[PDB]
Amino acid sequence: LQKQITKIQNFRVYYRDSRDPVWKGPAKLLWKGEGAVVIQDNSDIKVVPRRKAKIIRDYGKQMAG
Amino acid sequence: LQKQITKIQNFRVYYRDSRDPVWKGPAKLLWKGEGAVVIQDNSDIKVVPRRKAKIIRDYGKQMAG
Amino acid sequence: NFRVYYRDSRDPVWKGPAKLLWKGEGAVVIQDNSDIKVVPRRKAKIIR
Amino acid sequence: NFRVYYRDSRDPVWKGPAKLLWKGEGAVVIQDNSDIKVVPRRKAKIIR
Amino acid sequence: FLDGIDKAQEEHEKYHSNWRAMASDFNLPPVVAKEIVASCDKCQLKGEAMHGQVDCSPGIWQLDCTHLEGKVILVAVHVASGYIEAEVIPAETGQETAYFLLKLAGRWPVKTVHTDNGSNFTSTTVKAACWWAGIKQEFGIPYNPQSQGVIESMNKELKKIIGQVRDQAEHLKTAVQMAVFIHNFKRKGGIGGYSAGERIVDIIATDIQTKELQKQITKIQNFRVYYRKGPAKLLWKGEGAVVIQDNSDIKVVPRRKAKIIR
Amino acid sequence: FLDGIDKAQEEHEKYHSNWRAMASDFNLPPVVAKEIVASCDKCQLKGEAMHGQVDCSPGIWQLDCTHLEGKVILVAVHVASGYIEAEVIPAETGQETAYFLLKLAGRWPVKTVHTDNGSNFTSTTVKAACWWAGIKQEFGIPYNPQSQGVIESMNKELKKIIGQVRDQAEHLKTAVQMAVFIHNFKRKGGIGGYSAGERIVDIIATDIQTKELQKQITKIQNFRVYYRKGPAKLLWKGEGAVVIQDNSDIKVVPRRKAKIIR
Amino acid sequence: DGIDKAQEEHEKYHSNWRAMASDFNLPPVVAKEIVASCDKCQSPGIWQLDCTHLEGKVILVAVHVASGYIEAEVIPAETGQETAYFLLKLAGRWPVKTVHTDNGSNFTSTTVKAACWWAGIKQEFVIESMNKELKKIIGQVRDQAEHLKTAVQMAVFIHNFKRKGGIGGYSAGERIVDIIATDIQTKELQKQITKIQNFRVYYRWKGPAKLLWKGEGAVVIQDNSDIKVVPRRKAKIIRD
Amino acid sequence: DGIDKAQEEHEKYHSNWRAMASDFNLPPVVAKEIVASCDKCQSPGIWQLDCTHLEGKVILVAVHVASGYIEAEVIPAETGQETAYFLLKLAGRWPVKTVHTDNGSNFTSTTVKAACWWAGIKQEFVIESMNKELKKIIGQVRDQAEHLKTAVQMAVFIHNFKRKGGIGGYSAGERIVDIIATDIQTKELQKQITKIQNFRVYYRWKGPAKLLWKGEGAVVIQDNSDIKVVPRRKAKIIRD
DNA sequence: ACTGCTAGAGATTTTCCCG
DNA sequence: CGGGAAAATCTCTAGCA
DNA sequence: ACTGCTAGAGATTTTCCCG
DNA sequence: CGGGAAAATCTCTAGCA
Ligand SMILES: Nc1c(C(=O)NCc2ccc(F)cc2F)c(=O)n(O)c2ncc(CCS(=O)(=O)c3ccccc3)cc12
Ligand SMILES: Nc1c(C(=O)NCc2ccc(F)cc2F)c(=O)n(O)c2ncc(CCS(=O)(=O)c3ccccc3)cc12
Ligand SMILES: [Mg+2]
Ligand SMILES: [Mg+2]
Ligand SMILES: [Mg+2]
Ligand SMILES: [Mg+2]
Ligand SMILES: [Zn+2]
Ligand SMILES: [Zn+2]
Ligand SMILES: [Zn+2]
Ligand SMILES: [Zn+2]
């Protein structure tokens, strides 16, 4: 369970707010629902809509991690 | 002479730099030439081209001054 | 209640006022002369 | 010496390279095939 | 300045002054002159200076027909990744669009398709192919191509790449597929320094893996949270915050304020 | 990675990869992949992401013909102030443009006129009227209306105001002059909270008054400055800086660094 | 502090508020109140319109009577429609407030009356000497143009910007620009006075003084027809 | 610090670097070097192409042999022009590296050879069972479509996303997405290894160790075929 | 060697007004 | 000094063929 | 009830690399 | 810690009918 939580926290999320057209950086994924995505960006827990988020696992993880 | 210098310093200049499209605020006019305008904005003496400057005497000088 | 003035379809003339039925992020749903229209918020102005 | 690639007149195709004769704030004067053209800097790219 | 309101109104019915002109000429406060402007129906001629934000889900695709050399190219983009699929079609009918869309849905997991209100996409033929493949159809607001701002942008980029490889091929369809190759695999940059094909594989694999991981997390982490109230589904127990979901509302709570039972 | 340079070149001649794709695929540093892209003539397809800045002098005017209701409106704007002068003309010839321009130069101190390359403005008739009135003619770069971005913007605004007063008049020329009235005197806002007529009166009066004040200052303040060198015209002696002019170069100098003689 | 010196120089010289607000670095409302409390002391918008006749054509001439700045057009007919078009053009070009005409059939038309009503121009019922000078310049420059209206606009150019005179040696365009800048300053001072004529200040607590200036740290008021400067926290301003 | 535990679990179990880089929070170059120094241990781009015949029409079928993901088109003729078009479409859609064909006249054409040369596809000279399953699904869904190519694309949909099986119960589309994501990770690790295979590190000063990882405060090197972690200032990295 | 700008609509910051 | 409130400024967009 | 975006070109900030 | 240098990020534009 805790290993699966740390596994799902390895994914990066690129998100946007409602009136800012630029994409915010790689937030840490905390929870994924069907319509909402709970992330941690800039040590702030945020709730993004599912339509406003691109969740990847950046495969330049072969250096960092 | 000094009264004429303080008279010419009462005019306000709205200027622009070469790669900033927005108009900077009411700088104090110090010297006016045929192709250059020496101003004092933000306690910084600047030299603006004549084509990049709008020199007015704001007639809402009937309050301040 | 709101008044919406809008720009609709291949027409630079602005219509309105209309009743604001829905205000979403990005677009609005309005009702002008018993006609329901979806207008983007760039082509609409809402006054309370 | 510089190479200027430009976009000239009612034509989406990009021409070049040309010799940069003058680079001003806002526009450039270039020479392509012994033809001197004044191109805005939005429609021109200069490479050293 | 109550007489100034009447005089500013009867000059706004002539000149349609803005609020600053009436506030200067009739000594009105700015709220009163703004109310004189805002009551004139002839002066509401400008919209809100913003832009919307398209649906960047992993299932949404944006389709559009573009034209080049007297031929019609039907293009689709994956909005989350930028992965394109284009094809030169003989005509811009819906019978030829439904074949492209059924083929695309057979290739990739297409969940939603966002088009404009072109007859090709608005037809009953594309409506039956989407019902068969299980695709949801979204249509943009008419005469507003900004709603399709991804695919139209990709239209530009597609034509750009065709202009670089038009001489490497004899027919336009070959150059279109060559440009699809170059965009999907030979142009890197974006959110992960990826090409579009690497990004769509990463996005779809991430969606599958995160759905599996969350389905395995929420079946084992079966807790309830009382904050401030009532029971709530625990979504994420952190060290300084707790994310819950009650009344279909995902809400973040300070760690001082909640406690988790069960 | 020297073999990677050759392989990246021979794949850029096929695919025209950007620099990030070649730097990822062939392990090149970014400067080398950027040099492979920058040597391809087929890949220079984008210009500099900036804009220029038009001449905002007190003497420059920008003229343009716009069209409304099948009629031609010749519009002029004072670029420094926004003051417009428009007139419905019978035809878009240069004989009718030179009359408008000679009339405008008789009304206001017109020193320079910036137009596009319309035949009206490019003619020998407007060239003789400008020579008579002493006006300098500047022409924008062809098929680039951004060079006339003031007057074109005013074109928009002029038509906007005509759309608000089209029903107050019977003919278009009356509504055009009514809109010129409303823009020049009933729309406030800008650099001084002014209307366009107040701003042009302020700008021209300021130009006259500052020219007189500087002509009276520089005939009495006849000094010379040695800084760091050589003699230089003293322009402005301040408390922490000294502005001079030597070799036709206006230069600001610290007060520690210069000393003023004569 | 310079209010006192301005009051003594006004009781000595009866100076305008322009001189007192510049020789003593005063706000113009304070110097305006100094010159307004003195009992000893208790036009830019006027144009004049006429029609001349030359070579069978009719020329509408408008003269700014304060500066001599002319504005003339060859009109196709001496009709109230053409006169209303000329007046609407002139009102959109300059701040016109009153025209003085000569009881002509084209000046008392309903079309000119509606044009003056729309632009806010008073219509009342120098000019002949200006028409004489304009006809002299038209006769001077008639050889330089093919048509008459070109020669009329050339003469308007020469009169407004090439003929100088008066006391300072300025042209008519410089004179109308200075006169209308002075009128803008006058209207801005009247707006600034009307903005604070509805205030009453209670200071030190003595009676309702009238506010003249509200600065960054001090207010300037007038009580018992004499002016005093009060600190900001030692005053209460009530809009009444 | 977890390099030692990973080396002991590899000498016990012969684990892949995927397991060692995840069970011990290692960089993948370090676990790759652990599994590469072990002497005991010393396909996603392959497609297979065929042409089937149904109702007098010819169907080009490409099968990803690692996942079973099919891609089929009714082509108007069994011509190398149509085959080259199919291959260029497939190469633009998926990362194709090798196709396996059956020495046909349309597969050994010069047009297909030029298409494989342009897209960088090796051409070498499962598939029949996949054609049998695809023909079974086409016969299942032939009643739902008017034309054959619609039924072929419907069967490609049903095979790739509606038929599940294998060990995990995944469809062919999920399997090809996981396989190609694994290939992207493999190519990224090879790029990361090739980026630092040209470096030599002098540490503590002992000999030229090879660099495995250069972190924020420490470097990880391998000297004398054993791995050690060194501080950043106690190492000198020379590109040679 | 020449050149985007302008005004309005919201949003956010900054200054004022008295306690 | 401290909150509201109002003014000022910043951001951003259409339309100009 | 729906919605501008994308990639390149410079400019500026930020991080790295050794002393 | 300190300069260069290089990478990263920010800004901004055309074209998409
Ligand atoms: N296109 C013209 C626009 C225009 O596009 N406005 C939209 C626009 C878009 C962007 C922007 F920033 C501002 C902007 F206004 C325009 O406003 N005006 O006034 C024009 N006047 C005349 C001619 C034809 C020149 S020519 O054919 O006679 C020739 C050219 C060169 C050499 C010889 C002859 C074109 C135009
Ligand atoms: N105008 C179209 C553009 C376009 O303008 N691109 C330029 C552009 C400008 C700005 C921007 F942000 C992006 C952008 F691309 C376009 O790209 N596409 O694909 C279109 N496809 C089809 C139709 C006709 C719709 S209809 O007549 O069939 C109808 C409408 C409503 C109801 C019924 C029928 C128009 C367009
Ligand atoms: Mg379309
Ligand atoms: Mg389109
Ligand atoms: Mg033009
Ligand atoms: Mg124009
Ligand atoms: Zn109005
Ligand atoms: Zn290239
Ligand atoms: Zn007096
Ligand atoms: Zn092993």
Side-chain angles (χ1 to χ4, degrees), chain H residues 20-90:
Chain H
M20 272 174 302
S22 294
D23 303 359
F24 301 97
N25 198 0
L26 285 185
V29 190
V30 181
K32 179 87 178 169
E33 186 77 329
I34 289 168
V35 74
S37 287
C38 182
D39 193 279
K40 303 292 192 293
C41 314
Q42 294 178 355
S43 179
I46 317 290
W47 290 72
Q48 199 153 4
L49 260 175
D50 211 2
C51 279
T52 63
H53 291 74
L54 216 54
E55 312 183 3
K57 308 264 164 44
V58 51
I59 310 167
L60 262 164
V61 190
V63 175
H64 197 236
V65 304
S67 47
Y69 173 90
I70 65 171
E71 173 143 353
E73 295 291 323
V74 168
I75 43 161
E78 203 162 351
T79 298
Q81 188 70 222
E82 284 316 282
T83 309
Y85 189 55
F86 185 89
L87 257 178
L88 200 72
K89 258 177 170 174
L90 178 78

Side-chain angles (χ1 to χ4, degrees), chain G residues 181-233:
Chain G
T182 304
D183 188 24
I184 291 162
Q185 291 171 29
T186 299
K187 286 184 289 189
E188 282 302 281
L189 191 59
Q190 195 49 55
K191 283 171 192 168
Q192 201 66 76
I193 281 173
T194 307
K195 275 187 83 162
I196 62 179
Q197 70 171 18
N198 317 305
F199 294 159
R200 283 164 174 158
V201 184
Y202 287 82
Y203 71 110
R204 283 293 284 269
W205 275 20
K206 289 183 285 294
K210 52 164 299 175
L211 185 71
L212 308 182
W213 197 65
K214 176 176 57 201
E216 68 274 14
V219 307
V220 177
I221 59 185
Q222 180 195 74
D223 193 17
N224 315 327
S225 69
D226 59 41
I227 303 147
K228 51 206 68 175
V229 51
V230 176
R232 184 61 169 88
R233 311 186 210 271

Side-chain angles (χ1 to χ4, degrees), chain A residues 1 4 8-9 11 14 16-17 19-20 23 31-32 45 50-59, chain E residues 48-50 53 55-58 80 191-192 194 202-203 206-207 210 213-214 216 220 235-236 245:
Chain A
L1 193 68
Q4 288 178 321
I8 207 166
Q9 284 185 11
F11 300 98
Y14 290 81
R16 274 206 299 185
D17 287 283
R19 279 192 67 150
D20 198 349
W23 289 89
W31 182 81
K32 208 191 77 68
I45 318 293
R50 192 65 189 97
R51 65 188 201 267
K52 311 226 161 192
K54 303 173 168 164
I55 314 175
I56 62 161
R57 178 66 191 274
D58 189 2
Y59 296 141
Chain E
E48 193 183 336
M50 53 97 71
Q53 282 177 355
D55 207 302
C56 304
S57 295
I191 71 170
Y194 278 135
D202 195 7
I203 273 167
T206 305
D207 199 0
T210 50
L213 276 169
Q214 200 65 246
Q216 294 290 42
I220 303 300
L235 310 185
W236 185 72
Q245 183 177 5

Side-chain angles (χ1 to χ4, degrees), chain F residues 154-197:
Chain F
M154 292 310 191
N155 279 356
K156 179 198 83 66
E157 182 184 351
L158 183 63
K159 294 174 144 211
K160 206 161 165 183
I161 305 177
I162 292 163
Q164 318 190 232
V165 295
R166 196 54 200 86
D167 55 354
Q168 309 202 41
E170 195 61 61
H171 298 294
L172 186 61
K173 38 189 278 190
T174 311
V176 162
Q177 298 320 302
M178 282 192 325
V180 169
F181 181 85
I182 291 165
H183 173 79
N184 283 342
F185 295 111
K186 301 306 174 186
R187 298 291 167 99
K188 281 185 187 261
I191 71 170
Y194 278 135
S195 46

Side-chain angles (χ1 to χ4, degrees), chain B residues 3-7 9-13 15-16 24-25 27-28 30 32-33 38 54-55 62 64:
Chain B
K3 64 183 184 296
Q4 288 178 321
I5 286 174
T6 46
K7 214 195 273 182
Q9 284 185 11
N10 271 332
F11 300 98
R12 316 190 184 189
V13 181
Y15 66 100
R16 274 206 299 185
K24 319 284 197 178
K28 169 184 300 301
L30 310 175
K32 208 191 77 68
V38 183
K54 303 173 168 164
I55 314 175
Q62 321 277 278

Side-chain angles (χ1 to χ4, degrees), chain F residues 137-153:
Chain F
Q137 265 177 313
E138 296 269 16
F139 298 99
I141 288 162
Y143 315 107
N144 178 54
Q146 276 89 353
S147 312
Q148 301 95 38
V150 193
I151 181 62
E152 304 283 345
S153 178

Side-chain angles (χ1 to χ4, degrees), chain F residues 180-246:
Chain F
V180 169
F181 181 85
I182 291 165
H183 173 79
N184 283 342
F185 295 111
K186 301 306 174 186
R187 298 291 167 99
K188 281 185 187 261
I191 71 170
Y194 278 135
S195 46
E198 289 176 351
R199 204 178 302 114
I200 193 180
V201 168
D202 195 7
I203 273 167
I204 295 184
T206 305
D207 199 0
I208 293 169
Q209 282 153 17
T210 50
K211 190 165 186 184
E212 288 291 328
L213 276 169
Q214 200 65 246
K215 204 200 59 62
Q216 294 290 42
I217 280 170
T218 65
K219 71 182 287 185
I220 303 300
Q221 196 190 41
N222 270 118
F223 281 2
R224 65 182 67 189
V225 180
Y226 285 89
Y227 67 112
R228 286 185 173 167
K229 304 189 72 171
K233 293 296 294 295
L234 175 66
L235 310 185
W236 185 72
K237 180 179 182 292
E239 303 293 78
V242 163
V243 179
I244 61 169
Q245 183 177 5
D246 55 347

